[PDB]
Amino acid sequence: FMRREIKIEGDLVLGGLFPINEKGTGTEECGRINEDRGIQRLEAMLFAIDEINKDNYLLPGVKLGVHILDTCSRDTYALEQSLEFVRASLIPLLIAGVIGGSYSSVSIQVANLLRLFQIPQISYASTSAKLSDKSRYDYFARTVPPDFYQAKAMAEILRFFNWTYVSTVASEGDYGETGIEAFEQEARLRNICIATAEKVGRSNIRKSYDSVIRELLQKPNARVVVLFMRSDDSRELIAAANRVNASFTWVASDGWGAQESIVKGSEHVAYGAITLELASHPVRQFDRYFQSLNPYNNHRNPWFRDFWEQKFQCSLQQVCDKHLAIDSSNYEQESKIMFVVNAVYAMAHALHKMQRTLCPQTTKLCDAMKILDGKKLYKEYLLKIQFTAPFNPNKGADSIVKFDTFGDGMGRYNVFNLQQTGGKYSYLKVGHWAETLSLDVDSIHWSRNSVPTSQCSDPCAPNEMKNMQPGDVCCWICIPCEPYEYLVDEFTCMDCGPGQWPTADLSGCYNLPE
Amino acid sequence: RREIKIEGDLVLGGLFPINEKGTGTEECGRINEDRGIQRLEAMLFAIDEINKDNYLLPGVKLGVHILDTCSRDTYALEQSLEFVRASLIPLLIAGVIGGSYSSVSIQVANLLRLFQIPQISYASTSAKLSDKSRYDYFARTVPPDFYQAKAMAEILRFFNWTYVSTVASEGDYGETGIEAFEQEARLRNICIATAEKVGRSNIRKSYDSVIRELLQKPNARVVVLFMRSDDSRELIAAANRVNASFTWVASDGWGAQESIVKGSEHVAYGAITLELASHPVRQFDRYFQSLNPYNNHRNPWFRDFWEQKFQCSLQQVCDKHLAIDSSNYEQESKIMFVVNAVYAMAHALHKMQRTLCPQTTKLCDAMKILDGKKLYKEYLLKIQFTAPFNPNKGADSIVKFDTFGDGMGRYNVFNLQQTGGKYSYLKVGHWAETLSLDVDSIHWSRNSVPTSQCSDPCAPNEMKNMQPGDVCCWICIPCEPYEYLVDEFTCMDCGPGQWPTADLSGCYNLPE
């Protein structure tokens, strides 16, 4: 009966799309609140707009409004909601540009719609490589990189610890499939074999997941499982492994990232997991803003109440303590917030340079810009380069926001390790990827305190077996050697020669008596 | 804000260029009588018949939501939003019938695929639409211009017109259509004197400027046209002003439309045009001619249509006895395709209803929310005998689709004549896989089979043919009096004691 949205008027309006709510189960379209990647990212856009509307050097004279909608983590729903943005170009607010899409599937479908009406779009989290194709997504840009690189970071980590036999499980969609396709290619090149390639997807219940765990279990040697899955899917997969108490060493992409909500209730099954996330740094000023929010002062966000009640397990009108508050003990800035803020700022800077150009006499939205030329805006937005919203210290660690010729951001990632040292589970940065892998292996805590072994065949017996490679470079057979042969090396048996005999160790030959 | 909204258990959207493109600031202009109104009524006709048919969708009444595209892709696209807001007063759309201009069908297709809504065009011929990776919910009852271009090039190659000029409409129809021609041209050693093109928001001047430029290539007397209907009309009028005269070879955009040459009949005389191979739907003639402002209130565009066709007014008032009849009406060439497009959609839904609703003829719950993807990949396999409105079944009168969702590449060639004081299009041939036409029935511009070559033919008595750098133009070199033409391009000394024959084909001995 009621479909929520945020509508704030302005001289120029920016549309927004966030997975405020998780996907609905069964017949319902929306489910529980997505606390970190939903509410936080939403308020980070509101935070950016407020800051911009108080900035005298950026769009002074032009107030930015917004029209933020919920995607409910589903491309189809996001798509239906976005129709709201195009009808406006005919109560309805004219959309200068759209900020959003977290899931690549929604960003892509939304992009297919938006280009039809020349509406620029900037995503702050969609990493699918498909989105780099300017012949299909010509009005799309993003402040994050294409998984073309993330897939390399993952394959190079496996190649490092010599994990040549692994299983993979990808989410159906443009994120999981294209991302896993990239990995497979990077794997072949580095002689890494895939034991079993699984995949879950749309409208999947426990059984589809339990069925995946079972199939992973049918490849016991492949103890390292490469994941390229959506957040929600990852959560389901780990819950499935927790039931049958299965245990593997997970290598997950940003979809999983450094989210604690993913492993909650199955912390021991995900212990030792290694995950990736886009290299970013918290926006300090945002921490202050978000923590100051509460059901009393934050009425413009129609999802905040539901949020509040779920985060604290509340109720208003077990009632809730009017003294609750978001703080350093219960809140941690979502990993990609920086990208949301930069996205909004990039659109503002683009509009700002356009207004300086077409309206040389005032700071106001002059007649020449009453009807925006979206095509020009995009080909004015692509060439944008600016120092990251003030909320970023220094400027030496290349803190400039700009875009590739494909409209992408820079491929930089951080590697994380799920630890628990202090009784509580948390992610610890254990490395990073810029162009080459980098990580200090010593700070890594593994599953079962031993650096995993993930190879095709069982190791050869010492006392007499030689390692033999068939046709591939992942599997082998062990050939016991003749009692008179020793192991010159791991794969070769050689006759000790007359008068000599192999040592018990088989490392050499000793002289025979008698 | 006009439209046709008729409720039903299942609804089909429709798009037709009811109105011409608006000039300047206006979005819509005059009524498009044949390609707009007739085609629109043909869908209404088809829907009525299907609703009286006990063997096709019995128990499931088909309704419609028909909109005007005003011959513009952007306008059609905005209108089409109506079709998708529905899947959220608004009628849910099972499928869309339409797009005449390829540019509107393309843009509409990019929107419809996003909501898995199948679309069947009855006239959009662009080869682009065959790409199923881009237009995966699009199908059509007509073939791609990949073939039409071949038909045109082979016609030129036949009469040896190796030097021609081309003018194409800007847009997905003219540009891709002309590109295909150019390729087919090179392969048959046909050169393009000058490639012209008109387009969006073009006034007289742009066209006048094209005629001048065509005139700057006098040898190229044959001009190939791959233009929209409206653009063609503009180009012909322009030629009429400066009384220019060429032999036109136009694609179906022009087709067999008399409205294109009205007021410039003498300028287009002898023109050769193409149109998809089709036959009139007889039962449709009865239906259309029975329509009048008194009995046709469901078509909100009919009154304007009536007033323009008869130069009327209601409330020079109009004779209450006017009628659409055999002396002022002729079935539009593509009506058949419109009717078959609707029936194809109907047959697809019917098969789906038999499959998901095995126990009743009604739209059961299982089909409450249609799976458009399945529908499209259940419509592509459809094969049926053309709506009853087609005699025989031997002349392959079955409707079905390519793997690309296209129809069969069959065209007819027409010649604009005037023999009986009045101007008309006579069928002078056709193209199925190879060209075919009886050259004797063709009337040319200036009673002489046109000559369109780069250079003038060489004198016999002594000139040899010499090719410069290209393969279309040449110069003529007279031979020395003692040389003969071993062949068309080579003079050769008859040698001592000999001399060339009067005809220069050989050498004879000298006396004395």
Ligand SMILES: *[C@@H]1O[C@H](CO)[C@@H](O)[C@H](O)[C@H]1NC(C)=O
């Ligand atoms: C990977 O294998 C190579 C070759 O056997 C070995 O030198 C290297 O130490 C291994 N890396 C690790 C840390 O397992």
Ligand SMILES: *[C@@H]1O[C@H](CO)[C@@H](O)[C@H](O)[C@H]1NC(C)=O
């Ligand atoms: C040139 O065209 C004429 C007319 O159809 C035809 O009779 C003749 O054979 C053609 N000659 C060539 C070059 O093939």
Ligand SMILES: N[C@@H](CCC(=O)O)C(=O)O
């Ligand atoms: N990179 C993921 C989104 C992850 C996120 O929302 O943080 C995608 O492209 O679907």
Ligand SMILES: N[C@@H](CCC(=O)O)C(=O)O
């Ligand atoms: N074949 C033309 C349409 C001609 C017609 O409407 O009959 C096109 O694709 O633009």
